[PDB]
């Protein structure tokens, strides 16, 4: 059985060969990442005399077209940040090779899920969480500039990569599921643990969905575990409610999917449909360990983890987890918050 004249496997992927030369330019070294889209290889660019990462898209029309959207968004973004100061991965060029679209990037290190694994799922320090938070908010401020207006739509630890294994600098990757404010098309978006209430409820959405995901990500980076680990959409909404209470009535009264999760009382108030902790009783104050030595008590007696530090982090996270997307904190104001260092 032969796929793509022998070049592909039965998964639509290119069969990588160590040392292969492409186009009198690139020498392929080895596989360094993989996912639903295809593969990422380390390769030497002999023209520019540098190592690069090549994202080799599957040879299949749905995967090709997803990547063509990504290329257009990257070309728009990189063009408005030629100094590469806004924390988005740099697309150098693209080409078609043996029926695969190939995207050439600067080469990065480990992703933030890999980093959590390296902590044995116990979390990184509050100081490193703060560095990651400040860079992510800067990236979201850039995506919100009007000529872009880009919603990433799939933020999670595995889509944030370190630049270098010994340093805190990061870049955001994977714009294949992204869209622009003026061209919103998708009803079903965001990976479940990081999915915003407005999406769960079938309501209109905007760039605020990415700020919701960021709040969830930052808690998990410090505790080691996902904040809201639902098995399905009903479980996901119930896990959100355990921490944050019943959503406001002004929201539920306008939500097409309200009755998937809630019921309206004669009061006019809303409650859950019929095992969970009562609404709002799983306090973020206790998940973080504000007054009890951090997650698991493991930060007791460590510098950089005072009660005061934890109260500032809690305040910022609760603003990122506002149920109302009109009042949820926006990137400009997140960057001004006293959790961040002045200079
Ligand atoms: C080391 N690696 C893995 C790497 N290095 C540079 C860039 C990328 C990269 C660019 N887009 N995507 N999308 C999805 C997953 C990875 C990437 N990966």
Per DSSP, the residues of 182-236 read GG---SS-S-GGG--HHHHTT----THHHHHHHHHHHHHHHHSS-SS--SSHHHH
Cα–Cα distance list, 159 to 64, 177, 191 (Å):
20, 12, 11
Q: Strand, helix or coil at 319?
A: helix
Instruction: For residues 129 and 160, give the distance between their C-alpha atoms in angstroms, rounded to a whole number.
Output: 13
Max Cα separation, the chain?
74
CA torsion 164→165→168→172, rounded to 10°?
60
Q: Which residues have C-beta within 8 Å of that of residue 273, sequence separation ≥ 6?
A: 259, 261, 262, 263
Query: 154: Cβ below 6 Å to ligand 1?
Result: no
What residues form DSSP beta bridges with 150? 180
What residues form DSSP beta bridges with 264? 270
> What atom in ligand 1 is closest to the CA of residue 42?
1
Instruction: For residues 4 and 276, give the distance between their C-alpha atoms in angstroms, rounded to a whole number.
Output: 51
Q: Which residues have C-beta within 8 Å of that of residue 46, sequence separation ≥ 6?
A: 25, 26, 27
Q: Six-digit token pair at 331?
A: 């990137």
Whether 9 is catalytic is no
Cα of 108 to ligand 1 centre, how many Å? 7
C-beta separation of 205 from 256 below 8 A: no
Q: Six-digit token pair at 258?
A: 């309200």
Ramachandran class of 5: left when φ > 0, alpha when ψ lies in -120 to 50, beta otherwise: left
> What atom in ligand 1 is closest to the CA of residue 109?
1
The half-sphere exposure of 182 on its side-chain side, counting CA atoms within 13 A, is 6
Cα of 53 to ligand 1 centre, how many Å? 7
Q: Six-digit token pair at 214?
A: 């960021």
Look at residues 85, 139, 129 and name the one whose alpha carbon lies nearest to residue 335.
139
Instruction: For residues 82 and 156, give the distance between their C-alpha atoms in angstroms, rounded to a whole number.
Output: 26
Cα–Cα distance list, 327 to 208, 283, 320 (Å):
9, 21, 9
User: What phi and psi values does residue 242 have, to the nearest 5 degrees?
Assistant: -50, -40
User: What phi and psi values does residue 179 have, to the nearest 5 degrees?
Assistant: -150, 175
Mutate-to-test residue for ligand 1 from 32, 101, 105, highest number of ligand atoms within 8 A of CB = 105
The half-sphere exposure of 73 on its side-chain side, counting CA atoms within 13 A, is 23
H/E segment holding residue 57? strand 50-57
User: What phi and psi values does residue 6 have, to the nearest 5 degrees?
Assistant: 90, -5
Task: Write the burial class of residue 43 (CB in 10 Å: 0-12 exposed, 13-18 middle, 19+ buried).
Answer: buried
What residues form DSSP beta bridges with 179? 151
If you take atom 3 of ligand 1, which residue's CA is the nearest one? 33
Angle between helices 208-223 and 307-320 (to 10 degrees): 150
Instruction: For residues 58 and 37, give the distance between their C-alpha atoms in angstroms, rounded to a whole number.
Output: 6
Instruction: For residues 9 and 204, give the distance between their C-alpha atoms in angstroms, rounded to a whole number.
Output: 41
Query: 71: Cβ below 6 Å to ligand 1?
Result: no
Sign of CA dihedral 108, 170, 112, 66: negative
Q: Strand, helix or coil at 84?
A: coil
Task: Write the burial class of residue 282 (CB in 10 Å: 0-12 exposed, 13-18 middle, 19+ buried).
Answer: middle
Cα of 36 to ligand 1 centre, how many Å? 12
Which of the four CATH numbers 1.20.120.530, 1.10.357.10, 3.40.50.300, 1.10.510.10 does domain 82-88+108-343 have? Answer: 1.10.510.10
Task: Write the burial class of residue 74 (CB in 10 Å: 0-12 exposed, 13-18 middle, 19+ buried).
Answer: buried
Cα–Cα distance list, 318 to 109, 207, 220 (Å):
31, 17, 14
What residues form DSSP beta bridges with 48? none
C-beta separation of 209 from 196 below 8 A: yes
To one decimal, the resolution in angstroms is 1.1
What residues form DSSP beta bridges with 318? none
If you take atom 14 of ligand 1, which residue's CA is the nearest one? 174
Instruction: For residues 200 and 202, give the distance between their C-alpha atoms in angstroms, rounded to a whole number.
Output: 6
How does strand 170-172 pair with strand 150-151?
Answer: unpaired
Domain boundaries, the chain: 1-81+89-107, 82-88+108-343
Cα of 92 to ligand 1 centre, how many Å? 13
Cα–Cα distance list, 274 to 238, 247, 260, 262 (Å):
10, 16, 11, 9
């Amino acid at each position: 059985k032969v796929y793509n004249d022998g070049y592909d496997d039965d998964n639509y992927d290119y069969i990588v060969k160590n040392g292969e030369k492409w186009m009198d330019r690139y020498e392929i070294d080895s596989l360094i990442g993989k996912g639903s889209f295809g593969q990422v290889v380390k390769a030497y660019d002999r023209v520019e005399q540098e190592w690069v990462a090549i994202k080799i898209i599957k040879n299949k029309k749905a995967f090709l077209n997803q990547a063509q959207i990504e290329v257009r968004l990257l070309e728009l973004m990189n063009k408005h940040d030629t100094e590469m100061k806004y924390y988005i991965v740099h697309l150098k060029r693209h080409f078609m090779f043996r029926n695969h679209l190939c995207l050439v990037f600067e080469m990065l290190s480990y992703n933030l899920y890999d980093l959590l694994r390296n902590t044995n799922f116990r979390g990184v320090s509050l100081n490193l969480t703060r560095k990651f938070a400040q860079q992510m908010c800067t990236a979201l401020l850039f995506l919100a500039t009007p000529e872009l207006s880009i919603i990433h739509c799939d933020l999670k630890p595995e889509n944030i990569l370190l630049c270098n294994p010994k340093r805190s600098a990061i870049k955001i990757v994977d714009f294949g599921s992204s869209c622009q404010l003026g061209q919103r098309i998708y009803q079903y978006i965001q990976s479940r643990f990081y999915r915003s209430p407005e999406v769960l409820l079938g309501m209109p959405y905007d760039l605020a969905i990415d700020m919701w995901s960021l709040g969830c990500i930052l808690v998990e980076m410090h505790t080691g575990e996902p904040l809201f680990s639902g098995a399905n959409e009903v479980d996901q909404m119930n896990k959100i409610v355990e921490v944050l209470g019943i959503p406001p009535a002004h929201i539920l009264d306008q939500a097409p999917k309200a009755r998937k999760f809630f019921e309206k009382l004669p009061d006019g108030t809303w409650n859950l449909k019929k095992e969970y902790k009562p609404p709002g009783t799983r306090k973020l104050h206790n998940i973080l360990g504000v007054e009890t030595g951090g997650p698991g008590g493991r930060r007791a007696g460590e510098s950089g983890h005072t009660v005061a530090d934890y109260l500032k982090f809690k305040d910022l996270i609760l603003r990122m987890l506002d149920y109302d997307p009109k009042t949820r904190i926006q990137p400009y104001y997140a960057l001004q918050h006293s959790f961040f260092k002045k200079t």
